[PDB]
């Protein structure tokens, strides 16, 4: 399972990347506009992330129309080979994914909330599909069950689209994603930093330090 | 999972194809009767669908006897390489499927309501089998259970006949079909349309638009 | 799943074969004797069935001792390469199956009532094992459970003996046999005919033909 | 579980009743007309069965209309207190059951093929509901699964309508009915006579006879 | 399981009641808007339904604010003892349900789409809760699963609020509701009609009629 | 399932109570201190909450030793009969729960992380046990599994201690708590508000109000 | 679930009862002799335990023959109405249990290793049955599965014999016993102490402490 | 599933092979001594079995120490390439199996009673492992559950050691072994004979016979 | 399933290899200075273990910093090609594992207590991951459940990292590890010896003996 960082905060990205556990980054218009304040421009933020991160970097179009999505997609693609174009799950979006896929431009279909939407995105040739599990949790539906059905559907038809679990809120979304067999999770910084930690790890380290002092002060 | 459009409405077919999400079309005599009104000829409707759909197009024979079935099938086949001859699950139907399979004419056995009818059509050599899940729902039996049994049976014997779920009424027939692993669903246009939609998709788009306005008042992405 | 006809009527056989859904026949002296009427020779019926049928034809041995069984089995084998010799699950039967297997004479072990009997027959080299499910139902045991266990046992050891479900009484024996993955069922011609039928198939056909007449008065499909 | 005999053959009924294992009888227009040939009249057959059998005896109306069903029902009821009026599952039938039930006339709703039909019959106040399992088997559907769902539904709502399994074809319909917890089965004579039998019973009896001869010739 | 009719069509209501199978009615502003055309007043429609249905009749408030909800509820309640006030799942709605429950006015919380909304309505004291299963189906989630969770939750806490399955589209929503053990289903008239029907019922009737003719040519039962 | 508000804001509390869905409150010194602003006394906040709330109010002890805990618990008890004393799962905590239980002072055992800790607190006589599920989620263990085991354990022995799910982070902790059958959840005011919401509720309301206007221009319901 | 302490140490018993978490005690000659020290006699230790514990105290017999077991058991009963006599699962043991139950002397059948042995002891009238789960674990079979079967069997027949899980080695034997619904577990004082502990509890306490110092620096709530 | 005959009787072995249903044989000193009668020596019986059986013949060692076991095992191997040496699940046994496997001498580890013992014998290189299911049944645990676990474990690691179910007492041990997928069962000749029988088979034969007399009175098909 | 001995006693090791059931050894800060008594250099024992054992020998790094860990690991590697370097599940540890893997030095990540920690270690390229099951049991959670999830996760992604079950306390940890399919268990000597024992084996051996004395005094 790949692990991506879900933020446009360059400080969080640098830190995550320096830990060596970040395989890629996802952004979206909300995340970017949270950073693009007090002088900082969105075009600069996007370019800096592309430069910093070796692996896939998803950046979302904002046009809602086919021709506009495809032209924004190509500008996005031109920013560097690791760029992945995020396209929303809409009629125009599916058309855009199909065209971009034929042009070998990598794509990520976002705002997916049930397994049939994810299947449509895969049929359009999308590279990644990104169901939003935390937003399903928000409305009283166990979002991880949708990931489990998508995994089954994709296995049934030997689909090569990667399942990219998004809107992750806690480490149990991450655990369940790995048990299900999702291809990727994208996680906010506060979740990322917790994944390495456990209180018995801390306790064990202290114990080994103690015991070692008994044979080498 | 392939998705076919279950209609003879040319406007619906052109629209669905353009979404890139439609892999073929199924018709039946009812669907065609509906469109062949006010001067429109069934012959023209059929040829036009075949003309504009790249994927399989199922057209159903109307004879109930073996010889009429095969004679009509050979005509349907002659109209285009993407034509699939629909044949009902009957004694004459199975005979027709066996003959047509030996002639390398693609076939679709329709009006299937239990898994053993589906198996018999497969043994005769049919290309697709089409169980009618909504008509089972109509009589108080969960039709998707028959799809699950057919998938198991076909898997047991490595059967190459495609399961084509038909009489679809709602998006949960579609979801359950995909989870079971049916080869194809054929859906009405209104169902097809609904498959792309979700209130949280709409809501998420609106929020992204709004937030983006904060850093780009004309809502553009200039790179 | 293969389907054998449990019959010696040549017309039944020809008809089922044209349906594309009959793979072989299982006979017994009662079925054959039934057809020896209006002058017909017992042995002529059997030789005719062996000639016409492209595939397996089971013929019973009547001897109960090893030497009699193998001598009869050899005669039967000489009547056609597709003849299959039916031998009961007994001590002498197993000895006969082992001997005939070595001579490459195909065999069908009958009167099997539990899964270990089926395994012993497979170990002796038998081509088919025939558990009589309806005779277990008769004594208050669900006979299909024995088929399920035999399928599991045979899968465990990659056994090439075919499971031939016999003493079939209804279409649910057939459905369950297919879902389990039994290799073959043998059924009377009348169970076979019932397997194609469903009231919604008839209802659906009637409606399609009504609707077609609205666009084509004489029921025709002119293309 | 009660066991009824499903026939209008008086010879079969006498024999069954003499075994002491028959708790009642069901008839229907096909069964009765098979016996009412070569001089025998249907009115005589019905009366003879009513006289012979202590327990419930179901006899079916033939009118398809409400007023006609209710008038046939009352003539049926008047033939004796053990008479139970069979009414088909139709709109007019449900109306008739509701009226007959209010008049404390026992009823049996027949030609039931799914669990919701059975529930409708219970809501109309029917005494017995009779799903036809063998005719479901005939069309490639496991008829006993409908009995299992009816039992669950009836348990959920504490329904007092008795489930009467009909169109029985073999002893496994009977076994599964008892395991599910159906209230009644009605069985044809050839099935009835087999229920007491088992080859190990026969074998055991022979063995005990043998062994007893060794201590009392 | 109670069965309500989900319609404001007076003809449908009179017909269903006469089948003896309808235990109440649900309306909503859409259903009533549909009938309140060509001079027909919504006020008259509501009073007439109340007048002719003996069981509960749900009539939905239209105000979105607490005070308007309770004022309309008290009016609805005043029209007949069988009136049930429908209240949407909102903050003001829950406040209204709490007040109305304390006044012993029966209530029905509508537009419920997950089990926790259903629990909140129960805690406020509501008489019925109405989850919309077909609208969940519409967005690719199996709505009957929410009914199953609500039944479990209600059973856990011995909750007396009745589960009323709404937005029913087919007979399998009805079947699954009964197997789960929902208290009530409310169904459209065409669904209601279909619940009584089955092809084998029709077929069995025809056969009984035919056989009876053999011993009574005028198809009567003379006792 | 009871719902407690994890808050010391009196306005939040009043609002949740009017919704008919708040049964009590859980406080801690941080929450209380937060409200002591614009001149408000810490202890006045607590006494006000105890006076207004008809039902349980949890208040933390800060002493870590037995004598300090019971002396504080007694003070807290004196502030209102509905005060519940929060005591951590430690050796001295268990001694304090046993002593306070004998004095009929209600208690809530906090910092419970496995089911056996919950059982020991119940055996000491505790009124509520509070497992912190989100803090288990934080360390890569599904915290709701511990609630499920505690419910089973408590059911086995007919334990009267209430399970109070704490450290709740999202609406699925709440849904799962209800399906398991936990006695209580405690949630922040903002989780609480989210529990009422669903996009189809909003969509449905908007459509009903649109349709109603077709029959009643100013949105009114005049009866 | 009741919790007995497997010990004869009186400070261990007092400290357990004060937690409100100990319902009784299980002894054995080794445990008792361990405390029969510095003046204390074996009989003394048992009498003091019987006196201080408001609940069952299990005391073993060493005789392996019916007459000897029953004679000892009567003695033990004489010491206090809360004494419970331990009897091994043997032919003579079952005879002894039948006799003692008829004399309303409470009993505890030990060395039970399968569910049918447990059923036989119940049928003889035993008050408690003690399967030794850790010794099943020692020989490579999951001992808690035997507890599960005994629970099912006892529920089937509404048996009033209490299931007392013994030879406990870790907190998961305890957790599983509770989830199954065993009536009692007997554990050493140290296992007992471990049951209260969790690293997130310690972390939580530390967090409580620091945040309280924020609202008030001294460390006292007024 | 292979079926071995648990016996040293040569007429029992011939009659089993002729049915096509016997794949090998398992002996033990008691079985062999049973036939070492009327002139026949112990060595003779084993040599004749090795000669006539086209398959594995298991022969036990009586030494319980490593050196003695290995010395005997080499002797047994010398008697024929199809001899298989039985070695008990002990410390010295595992040492012996390791040594013998390295010398391509086939082995059969006996007295296995849990799945981990079976795994240890496999790891030492054993050809067959023989769990004694009936002796587990004797002590009130379902012995076939151990076979199921060993099957899972061996499948997990693609272990080539064959599971040989032993101490078989009834046809249901055999049925369950086959459903689980055990490689082999070893059974006494009488159990073997019972496996072919069913009362509906006998009934069927009788029915066949009578109905054939209807189509032709003599009893011969021409 | 491989079996390692958690010891540095050479006799215990030779004994277990002789049995043919020991595949390696794990040596942690809390064993080597057990055997460094009266004559032996915590380094002659390690060097000798490395010489003896024809399989992996795990040796723990004591530094907590990346740079010290990789320097110590390279030293450990220098002692013998069967040395495996034990590294704790920390930020610095993951970084060290990634570096050492790239230098083809085998690694064993210790103090793992949940499945996502194990996945992170595998993503860093670790040769073994060692979850401490008994220490989870100690805090009231069933440690074997974590092994079961890690097996599933590793199967999902075809992960080549071996699952090495550690902190083993009893033979049921071992049985469950084998049924789950863990790659390795590491056990103390007394657990190891107990794995061969069963009371019916002893009973059985006595009976072989007794019956043999009958046939041959
Ligand atoms: O905004 P959220 O938390 O639903 O997540 C969306 C980015 O994954
Ligand atoms: O909806 P139906 O039943 O008319 O189905 C049409 C075949 O897809
Ligand atoms: O005619 P059948 O066999 O379907 O049965 C109907 C009487 O139960
Ligand atoms: O079918 P819907 O969604 O309009 O449902 C109406 C409420 O029963």
Give the residue on H whose Cα is nearest the Cα of I172: H116
Using CA atoms in the order F171, F172, F175, F177, what is the torsion angle rounded to 10 degrees? Answer: -110
- Per the structure block, which two tokens stand in for I149? 């999830």
F112 neighbourhood in chain G, CB within 8 Å: 201
| Ligand 1 atom 5 nearest Cα | A167
CA I44 to chain centre: 21
Nearest to D4 by CA among D124, D110, D141, D120: D110
**Cβ contacts of residue B219 below 8 Å, gap of 6+?**
A62, B209, B212, B213
Nearest to D177 by CA among D153, D156, D147, D154: D147
Facing A174 at nearest CB: one of I111, I116, I149: I116
Contact (CB<8Å) F200/B199 = yes
- What ligand 4 atom has the least distance to the C-alpha of E166? 8
Q: Please give the domain boundaries of chain B with CATH numbers for all domains.
A: 1-223 (3.20.20.70)
Rounded distance, CA F202 to CA E33, Å?
Answer: 19
DSSP assigned state of A1:
-
User: Is residue E81 classed exposed, middle or buried when 0-12, 13-18 and 19+ CB atoms within 10 A define those classes?
Assistant: exposed
Going through chain B in order, the beta strands assigned E by DSSP cover: 2-6, 24-26, 57-60, 83-88, 107-112, 128-131, 162-165, 184-187
- What ligand 1 atom has the least distance to the C-alpha of A166? 8
DSSP assigned state of G222:
-
Which of B111, B115, B148 best tests the C interface by mutation, with the highest count of C CBs <10 A?
Answer: B111
Buried b / exposed e over B158-189, threshold 16 CB at 10 Å, is ebebbbbbbbbbbbbbbbbbbbbbbbbbbbbb
Nearest to A191 by CA among D122, F137, I142, F201: F137
Rounded distance, CA I70 to CA I77, Å?
Answer: 10
- Per the structure block, which two tokens stand in for C130? 């025939």
Active-site annotation of D, residues = 86
DSSP assigned state of F161:
P
Rounded distance, CA G3 to CA G25, Å?
Answer: 8
- Per the structure block, which two tokens stand in for I30? 């809390």
Residue bearing tokens 């047509």 = B100
Nearest to A208 by CA among I92, I139, I28: I28
**Degrees, nearest 5: CA angle A50-A56-A58:** 75
Rounded distance, CA H25 to CA H58, Å?
Answer: 6
**Cβ contacts of residue H82 below 8 Å, gap of 6+?**
H24, H50, H53, H54, H55, H56, H57
Residue H134: enclosing H or E segment and its boundaries?
Answer: helix H133-138
Residue bearing tokens 């709505």 = E143
Residue D194 · residue D174 · CB < 8 Å:
no
Rounded distance, CA B146 to CA A51, Å?
Answer: 54
Rounded distance, CA H133 to CA G177, Å?
Answer: 28
Do you know the residue count of chain A?
Answer: 217
Q: Which residues line ligand 1 (CB under 6 A)?
A: A 6, 28, 132, 134-135, 166-167, 186
CA E72 to chain centre: 21
Facing F169 at nearest CB: one of A170, A175, A198: A170
Rounded distance, CA B110 to CA B108, Å?
Answer: 6
Residue E66: enclosing H or E segment and its boundaries?
Answer: helix E66-78
Ligand nearest, relative to CA of residue B33? 2
Tell me the three state secondary structure of residue H113. Answer: coil
- Per the structure block, which two tokens stand in for F223? 């009866």
- The pair phi, psi for residue A73, each rounded to 5°, is -55, -45
Rounded distance, CA A142 to CA A152, Å?
Answer: 17
Q: Is the CB of D132 under 6 A from ligand 3?
A: yes
| Ligand 2 atom 1 nearest Cα | B167
Looking at the complex, report in whole angstroms how far the Cα of residue B86 sits from the nearest Cα belonging to chain C: 12
Rounded distance, CA D30 to CA D59, Å?
Answer: 11
Buried b / exposed e over C45-56, threshold 16 CB at 10 Å, is bbebbbeebeeb
- Per the structure block, which two tokens stand in for D139? 């069309």
Residue bearing tokens 């069979």 = D86
Resolution for this model in angstroms, one decimal place? 1.8
Whether E171 contacts chain B with CB within 8 A: yes
Selected residues 194-213 of chain E with any CB under 8 Å from a CB in chain C: 199-200, 203
Rounded distance, CA H162 to CA H106, Å?
Answer: 11
Q: Is the dihedral of CA E213, E218, E221, E223 positive or negative?
A: negative
- The pair phi, psi for residue D143, each rounded to 5°, is -60, -30
Which of G199, G200, G201 best tests the A interface by mutation, with the highest count of A CBs <10 A?
Answer: G199
Nearest to C126 by CA among C139, C117, C135, C134: C117
Residue bearing tokens 């089948």 = E19
Tell me the three state secondary structure of residue C169. Answer: coil
Residue G36 · residue G42 · CB < 8 Å:
yes
Rounded distance, CA I142 to CA I139, Å?
Answer: 9
Facing F117 at nearest CB: one of I114, I115, I140: I140
**Cβ contacts of residue C180 below 8 Å, gap of 6+?**
B156, C144, C147, C148, C151
Contact (CB<8Å) B141/D141 = yes
Nearest to D80 by CA among E222, E223, E212: E223
- Per the structure block, which two tokens stand in for G142? 């999951």
Residue bearing tokens 């000669």 = H51
**Chains A & I: contacts with CB separation below 8 Å:** 88
Residue A161: enclosing H or E segment and its boundaries?
Answer: none
Using CA atoms in the order H153, H159, H162, H166, what is the torsion angle rounded to 10 degrees? Answer: -20
- Per the structure block, which two tokens stand in for C82? 């597709």
Rounded distance, CA A29 to CA H36, Å?
Answer: 91
Going through chain E in order, the beta strands assigned E by DSSP cover: 2-6, 24-26, 57-60, 83-88, 107-112, 128-131, 162-165, 184-187
Rounded distance, CA D168 to CA D161, Å?
Answer: 20
User: Is residue A121 classed exposed, middle or buried when 0-12, 13-18 and 19+ CB atoms within 10 A define those classes?
Assistant: buried
Which ranges constitute the DSSP H helices of chain C?
10-18, 29-35, 42-52, 66-78, 91-102, 115-123, 133-138, 144-156, 171-180, 189-194, 199-213
Rounded distance, CA G84 to CA A197, Å?
Answer: 49
**Degrees, nearest 5: CA angle B164-B168-B170:** 135
Nearest to H47 by CA among H101, H7, H8: H8
- Per the structure block, which two tokens stand in for A103? 């042009």
Rounded distance, CA E93 to CA H167, Å?
Answer: 72
C174 neighbourhood in chain B, CB within 8 Å: 116
- Chains C and H touch each other (3 or more Cβ pairs < 8 A): yes
- Per the structure block, which two tokens stand in for I124? 């860093």
Which of D167, D172, D195 best tests the C interface by mutation, with the highest count of C CBs <10 A?
Answer: D172
User: Can you give the three-state secondary structure of chain I, one letter per residue?
Assistant: CEEEECCCCHHHHHHHHHHCCCCEEECCCCCHHHHCCCCCCCCHHHHHHHHHCCCCEEEECCCCCHHHHHHHHHHHHHCCCCEEEEEECCHHHHHHHHHHHHCCCCEEEEEECCHHHHHHHHHCCCCEEEEEHHHHHHCCCCCHHHHHHHHHHHHHCCCCCEEEEECCCCHHHHHHHHHHCCCEEEECHHHHHHCCCCHHHHHHHHHHHHHHHHHCC
| Ligand 2 atom 5 nearest Cα | B167
Rounded distance, CA H195 to CA A4, Å?
Answer: 61
Which of B170, B175, B193 best tests the E interface by mutation, with the highest count of E CBs <10 A?
Answer: B170
Whether D101 contacts chain E with CB within 8 A: no
Residue bearing tokens 């310690």 = G202
Rounded distance, CA C110 to CA D148, Å?
Answer: 34
- Per the structure block, which two tokens stand in for E161? 């609020």
Tell me the three state secondary structure of residue G71. Answer: helix
Residue from B86, B193, B200, B207 carrying the catalytic annotation: B86
Rounded distance, CA E108 to CA E126, Å?
Answer: 6
Ligand nearest, relative to CA of residue E164? 4
Nearest to E137 by CA among F194, B144, D153: B144
**Cβ contacts of residue G160 below 8 Å, gap of 6+?**
none
Which residues pair with residue G132 across a beta bridge?
G166
Contact (CB<8Å) A216/I64 = no
**Cβ contacts of residue H81 below 8 Å, gap of 6+?**
none
A137 neighbourhood in chain F, CB within 8 Å: 170-172
**Cβ contacts of residue D146 below 8 Å, gap of 6+?**
D113, D114, D115, D118, D131, D133, D136
Residue E34 · residue E44 · CB < 8 Å:
no
Q: Other C-beta atoms within 10 Å of C106: how many?
A: 20
- The pair phi, psi for residue D69, each rounded to 5°, is -65, -45
| Ligand 1 atom 2 nearest Cα | A167
Using CA atoms in the order A60, A61, A62, A63, what is the torsion angle rounded to 10 degrees? Answer: -160
**Degrees, nearest 5: CA angle H145-H150-H156:** 130
Nearest to H105 by CA among H70, H64, H53, H154: H70
Nearest to B96 by CA among B117, B72, B132: B72
Determination technique used: X-ray
Using CA atoms in the order G133, G135, G141, G142, what is the torsion angle rounded to 10 degrees? Answer: 30
Distances (CA, A) of B16 to A95, B84, B195, E132, G116: 11, 20, 12, 29, 68
**Cβ contacts of residue B191 below 8 Å, gap of 6+?**
B168, B169, B170, B171, B174
Which ranges constitute the DSSP H helices of chain F?
10-18, 29-35, 42-52, 66-78, 91-102, 115-123, 133-138, 144-156, 171-180, 189-194, 199-213
- What ligand 2 atom has the least distance to the C-alpha of B26? 8
Residue B19 · residue A95 · CB < 8 Å:
yes
Nearest to F3 by CA among F210, F161, F151, F175: F175
Distances (CA, A) of E128 to E58, E89, E108, E118, H18: 10, 12, 4, 9, 75
Residue G24 · residue G55 · CB < 8 Å:
yes
Q: Is the CB of B191 under 6 A from ligand 2?
A: no
DSSP assigned state of B132:
B
Q: Name the residue of A6, A9, A141, A186 to mutate for ligand 1: max ligand atoms within 8 A of Cβ.
A: A6
Q: Other C-beta atoms within 10 Å of I41: how many?
A: 10
Residue D168 · residue D185 · CB < 8 Å:
yes
Distances (CA, A) of A149 to A118, A167, E172, E215, I184: 10, 17, 22, 59, 33
Distances (CA, A) of A15 to A18, A20, A33, A193, C180: 5, 9, 20, 10, 56
Q: Other C-beta atoms within 10 Å of F160: how many?
A: 10
| Ligand 2 atom 4 nearest Cα | B167
Whether D114 contacts chain B with CB within 8 A: yes
Rounded distance, CA F161 to CA F154, Å?
Answer: 8
Rounded distance, CA H84 to CA E5, Å?
Answer: 78
Whether I123 contacts chain A with CB within 8 A: yes
**Cβ contacts of residue F68 below 8 Å, gap of 6+?**
F61
Facing A36 at nearest CB: one of B171, B205, B215: B215
Which ranges constitute the DSSP H helices of chain D?
10-18, 29-35, 42-52, 66-78, 91-102, 115-123, 133-138, 144-156, 171-180, 189-192, 199-213
Distances (CA, A) of A116 to A125, E140, H130: 14, 7, 52
**Chains B & F: contacts with CB separation below 8 Å:** 5
Do you know the residue count of chain F?
Answer: 223
Residue F132 · residue F113 · CB < 8 Å:
yes
Q: How many Å lie between the centroid of ligand 3 and the Cα of residue D189?
A: 12
Contact (CB<8Å) E141/A116 = no
Q: Is the CB of E132 under 6 A from ligand 4?
A: yes
Contact (CB<8Å) E200/C199 = yes
- Per the structure block, which two tokens stand in for C180? 């389990």
Whether A113 contacts chain E with CB within 8 A: yes
Residue B27 · residue B189 · CB < 8 Å:
no
Q: Other C-beta atoms within 10 Å of G56: how many?
A: 22
Residue C128 · residue C109 · CB < 8 Å:
yes
Q: Is the dihedral of CA G45, G49, G50, G51 positive or negative?
A: positive
Residue F117 · residue F89 · CB < 8 Å:
yes
**Cβ contacts of residue C177 below 8 Å, gap of 6+?**
C1, C144, C147, C165, C168, C185
Facing B198 at nearest CB: one of A63, A76, A114: A114
Give the residue on E whose Cα is nearest the Cα of F14: E95
Contact (CB<8Å) I116/A178 = yes
Q: How many Å lie between the centroid of ligand 3 and the Cα of residue D6?
A: 8
Residue I127 · residue I104 · CB < 8 Å:
no
Contact (CB<8Å) C171/D139 = yes
Q: Name the residue of A166, A177, A189 to mutate for ligand 1: max ligand atoms within 8 A of Cβ.
A: A166
């Amino acid at each position: 399972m790949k692990i991506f960082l879900d933020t446009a905060n360059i400080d969080e990205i640098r830190t995550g990347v320096n830990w060596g556990i970040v395989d890629g980054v996802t952004t979206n218009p909300t995340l970017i506009s949270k950073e693009a304040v007090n002088g900082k421009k969105y075009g600069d933020i996007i370019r800096e992330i592309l430069k910093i991160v070796d692996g896939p970097v998803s950046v979302q179009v904002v046009s809602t129309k086919y021709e506009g999505m495809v032209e924004e997609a190509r500008k996005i693609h031109g920013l560097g080979d690791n760029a992945v174009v995020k396209i929303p799950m809409t009629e125009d979006g599916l058309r855009a994914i199909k065209t971009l896929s034929s042009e070998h431009i990598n794509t990520n279909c976002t705002l997916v909330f049930n397994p049939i939407q994810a299947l449509l995105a895969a049929k359009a040739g999308v590279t990644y599909v990104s169901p939003y599990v935390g937003r399903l949790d928000d409305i009283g539906e166990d979002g991880m069950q949708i990931i489990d059905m998508i995994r089954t559907i994709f296995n049934n038809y030997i689909i090569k689209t990667q399942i990219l679990v998004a809107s992750i809120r806690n480490p149990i979304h991450v655990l369940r994603s790995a048990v299900i067999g999702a291809d990727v999770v994208t996680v906010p910084f506060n979740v990322l930093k917790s994944l390495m930690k456990h209180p018995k790890t801390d306790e064990g380290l202290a114990k080994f330090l103690e015991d070692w002092k008994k044979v080498s002060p």
